[PDB]
Amino acid sequence: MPEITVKVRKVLNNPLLQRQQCVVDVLHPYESKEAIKAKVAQQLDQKNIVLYGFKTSFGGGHTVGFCNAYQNMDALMKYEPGFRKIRCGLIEAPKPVSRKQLKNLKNRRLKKRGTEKAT
Amino acid sequence: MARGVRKHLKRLNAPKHWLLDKMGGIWAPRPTNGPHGLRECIPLILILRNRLHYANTYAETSMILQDKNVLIDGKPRTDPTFPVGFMDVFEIPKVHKTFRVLYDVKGRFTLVPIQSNEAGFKLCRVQKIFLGDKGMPYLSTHDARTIRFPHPDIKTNDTIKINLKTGKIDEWYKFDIGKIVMVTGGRNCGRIGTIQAIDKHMGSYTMIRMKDTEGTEFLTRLCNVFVIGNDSPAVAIPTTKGIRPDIIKNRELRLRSI
Amino acid sequence: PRISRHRNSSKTYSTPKKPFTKPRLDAELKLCGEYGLKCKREIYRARYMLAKIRRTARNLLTLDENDIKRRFEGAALLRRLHMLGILDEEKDQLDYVLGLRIEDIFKRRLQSVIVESKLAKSVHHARNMIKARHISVGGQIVNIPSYMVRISNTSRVAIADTSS
Amino acid sequence: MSKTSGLYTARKLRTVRRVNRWADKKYRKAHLGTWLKANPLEGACMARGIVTQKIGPNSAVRKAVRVQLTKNSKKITAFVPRDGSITYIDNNDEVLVAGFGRAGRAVGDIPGCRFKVIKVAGIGLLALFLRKREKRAR
RNA sequence: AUCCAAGGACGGCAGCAGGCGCGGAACUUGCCCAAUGCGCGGCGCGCGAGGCAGCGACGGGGAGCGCGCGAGCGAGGCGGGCCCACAGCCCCCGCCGCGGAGCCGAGGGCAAGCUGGUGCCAGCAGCCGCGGUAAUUCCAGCUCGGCGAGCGUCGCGCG
RNA sequence: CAUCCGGUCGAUCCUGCCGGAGCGCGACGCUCUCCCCAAGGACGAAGCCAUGCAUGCCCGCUCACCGGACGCGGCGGACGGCUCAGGACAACGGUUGCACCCCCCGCGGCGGUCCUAGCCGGACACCGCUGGCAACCCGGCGCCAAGACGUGCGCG
Ligand SMILES: [Mg+2]
């Protein structure tokens, strides 16, 4: 187990978003980001964080990414791309519906007149 | 011929000084009509996303603006494409950041942090005097502002000081030889210097000759010469005193920074 | 249109105007043997680069010594050549540039620096080792045989810390 | 001397070159327009046609065929080079016909032939003469 | 050009896919608005604009079919990461581990030669020319040369 | 990145052409291990089109049903995307002018109106009853809403 030292770079305050900007690099000459969350938490709740941009350089020695620490969950709930919420343990993802059928339904509905709740 | 006005703007056709990446996308923000024109302005979103980085996307800028988190000339604006121009006032009380928008030597927009003593006024250029309805005199400025009943002593090309809270003239600096100016158009945008001569050609442009503080001399037409005080700037300006270095010095500075 | 249409592209090599010429064939084979070169496109790339350097040097040389453009461009070219190690440090005149040859280009290849450090038994052995990923240029492993090494990293090319 | 050389005489030079550059046979053949109309291939790399009859100091008879171009309806002869390819061409078979090395002119000792046969029923002649493919579908 | 319960009614893909015809000649009747912007509007909607994937030797760039007297390593498959609107793909991590070159030519231009056939026949040949019994040029084998995942042929433009 | 070679003769020097040698654009033939970028029905048919999709949104108007429908109203649909038929002092490119011009949104100003005003009048939509025709299409009666329509208080 090579101890994985992780830093923070380009740290900015976002009171408008009630969050803190962060660039994190992990040196593992790693625990699928979950332990990296704890490490960033100690560097700066552990569930008020989200990690989206994570790439591995050639050879795998150095990996860099971006963080996002929110003051409270409600601020996160308001300010957060939906698919990021699904990726994190935040909400369940309902089964999506194909846009083709929606378009067909919209056209058919536009065809009928007056009360068209039938279809 | 398009049957109407234009609502789009290709990224490759955007002004050079906005510094937009070629691969960012096909489209770029289209500024809306307001205080300043297309080629003499910059959108708010560009300042708030590509510089200060307080936002990462269009949506975040939308939320920040619609929450009323930015003030322009003392007035909150909620349009991401609102045009920001020259000698404007930028305030974000949440982080206590006050900026006045000026020009750098290289010819691009910059934010000059300022104090509370001088953020209650702005400098504007007067370039039109005319008679309105009933014959009442008026005047106009570079930021699309009209004032009724000015002093007769004020003439065209002058410069006017007006309070942000109230559009009432406080003092006016005349256009005369021996006054510090700031160039705002063409090859010499951002250079600071003092006037030396004025030559007029009937029916055409008027050329102005200025000398920099270090002795450099340059020229330009009268349509892009702005007065900023009497022998000394009235406002705080960037770190450098309007000195455009040569290529050798810029390369040396880059090497030092690398 | 798609954004993919704005991606630039160009070739990087040239072909001799007279193909069948015995001396050229023999010289190219000899250079391949002393540098273990795969095909003949690498020599063409080298000649392309050399031609660019020579043309720049010529254009700068036609101009006056005190020409601002001359100073700027010559300084940049000299800095690049020195940082690459192709041109010796003691030389700082543009005239010396015209006397450079592709061999000086070859000597700064990864295989070259590997061999002259005695780290490898041969050019072919060096290439095969490079492929297997046993080499750590600077602190980063590199598997490109034609990777060029600058002066500041020549002392830092080592064996991979992960290789067996 | 012979040519004009005054400082205000570019018009005459342009006119003279414009007039005199029509004397070259190649330039005429390329820019005049007669050849393009008279060429049964109308500037195309090669044509698709239909064969209709087989015929053939050196004293060797060369094997060729009469063809009619689909898009043109004029008649020409195209010569099948590779040995044993006469049997590979049958009367009323779709073919693709290109040109010899010398555009327009005849090539070699063959009199009155200026084309080549390179495909029959959609198979390259070279691919068939080497037995790579086979014409069992026709 | 279409539907008609024959009185009437209806249409304009040089928009995205798809089809017929034409020609020497050119792809999926896919998913999504997450990104860049547009319209409306406050905590969003819609957009075949636009993005992602599928086909794709127009094409461009980077590696490889071994080095050595034994070890090593690829492509390939199995699982986990990361990325992604969802999926792929690159890259990282453990286990088992497919090593494959063709297209032209050998008289000169033009680098590159040994027997058997045929006999101005069959054929080669951009030009000169070969073939009417050693055919250094056709048809096969051996050998050899060029370029190389590319090679050759046809037409056009520049030189 | 300033290059030439073979062919008229019994032999030789010239003129002069023919052919070869390179690059790019496409089409054809053969062949093909791995990764990255990437064009793609334009080539005297601007020829013809099944099938499906490509422009909606909402601030005002709820005794509709249990506020979401629907419809009136407002904004937009003149941007975007496809192609190069037509057209040769035109278009187009650089440079002037309107003291011969028009201009939505947006920004800043200004805002004095001749001769029931605690707030005016009537309609239509959707909708209920009644019906025509294959289809497309609409009819007749009926109460009801407006930031809709009409009139209109007022310092020329
Ligand atoms: Mg009145």
Characteristics of this structure?
part of a larger assembly; 4 chains; A: 119 residues; alpha+beta; Alpha-Beta Plaits; six-stranded antiparallel sheet; 23% strand; elongated; D: 138 residues; 4 helices; 6 strands; binds magnesium ion; RNA-binding; NA-bd_OB-fold (chain D); Ribosomal_uS12_euk/arc (chain D)
Beta-strand percentage of chain C? under 5%
Distance between the termini of chain A: 62 Å
Summing up helix and strand content along with how strands pair, one would put the structural category of chain A as alpha+beta
What's the shape of chain A?
elongated
Largest interface (C-beta under 8 Å): A-B, 8 and 9 residues
Report Rg of chain A: 21 Å
The tally of domains of chain C stands at 1
GO molecular function (chain B): RNA binding; rRNA binding; structural constituent of ribosome
Keywords (chain B): Ribonucleoprotein, Ribosomal protein, RNA-binding, rRNA-binding
InterPro entries (chain B): KOW (IPR005824), Rib_uL2_dom2 (IPR014722), Ribosomal_eS4 (IPR000876), Ribosomal_eS4_C (IPR032277), Ribosomal_eS4_central_region (IPR013845), Ribosomal_eS4_central_sf (IPR038237), Ribosomal_eS4_KOW (IPR041982), Ribosomal_eS4_N (IPR013843)
Organism (chain B): Giardia intestinalis (strain ATCC 50803 / WB clone C6) (Giardia lamblia)
Give an account of the 3D structure.
- The structure is cut from a larger assembly and holds chains A (119 residues), B (258 residues), C (164 residues) and D (138 residues).
- By secondary structure, chain A is of the alpha+beta class.
- Chain A is built from 4 helices and 6 strands, in the order βββαβββααα.
- Chain A has a single domain, classed as Alpha-Beta Plaits (2-Layer Sandwich).
- In chain A, β4 and β5 (62-66) form a beta hairpin.
- Chain C is 49% helix and 4% strand.
- In chain C, α2 runs antiparallel to α3.
- The longest helix of chain C has 22 residues, at 41-62.
- The N and C termini of chain D lie far apart (72 Å).
- Chain A binds chain B through residues 12-17, 21, 79, and chain B through 53-54, 60, 63-64, 67, 69, 94-95.
- The structure holds magnesium ion (MG).
- Chain B binds 2 RNA strands through residues 2-9, 11, 24-30, 32-36, 57-58, 62-63, 66-67, 78-79, 82-83, 132-133, 136, 138, 140-141, 143-148, 167.
- Chain D: InterPro entries: NA-bd_OB-fold, Ribosomal_uS12, Ribosomal_uS12_euk/arc.
- Chain D: One of its GO terms (molecular function) is structural constituent of ribosome.
- Chain D: This is SSU ribosomal protein S12P.
